[PDB]
Amino acid sequence: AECSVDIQGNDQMQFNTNAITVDKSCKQFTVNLSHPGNLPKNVMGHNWVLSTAADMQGVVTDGMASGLDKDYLKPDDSRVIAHTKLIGSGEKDSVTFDVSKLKEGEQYMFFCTFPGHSALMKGTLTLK
Ligand SMILES: [Cu+]
């Protein structure tokens, strides 16, 4: 099983994948995020945040109101399953989480919580 994925967030406010499949055989899953853009994190910062599809809107809404210093995430938000830090041009960050934090039959979404970015920077994640 392929238990990791490399993802990029760029200056065009786009991730380079719209869907991630996590194989059930995997015990852990790793996301390696990078920023090939030129813009700094205060204007084009990107993070990779995971939640159920149902909780996405709440996480995004409260994240925006949280500010840059809080990585645009509501402190201790229980709806966030896993997340990388917010990164800007030339930076990279990885996050590894336990696959047992996911279940079959539930739709998950990964997205960036920087203000306005989730309109384009989002995708599905599914355990199969
Ligand atoms: Cu972003």
From Swiss-Prot:
InterPro entries (UniProt xref): Azurin, BlueCu_1, BlueCu_1_BS, Cu-binding_ET, Cupredoxin
GO CC annotation terms, alphabetical: periplasmic space; plasma membrane
Binding site for Cu cation: H46, C112, H117, M121
Keyword Transit peptide: no
Keywords: Copper, Disulfide bond, Electron transport, Metal-binding, Periplasm, Signal, Transport
Residue ranges constituting the Plastocyanin-like domain according to the UniProt record: 1-128
Job of this protein: Transfers electrons from cytochrome c551 to cytochrome oxidase.
PANTHER family, alphabetized: AURACYANIN-B (PTHR38439), OUTER MEMBRANE PROTEIN H.8 (PTHR38439:SF2)
Protein name: Azurin
Gene expressing this chain: azu
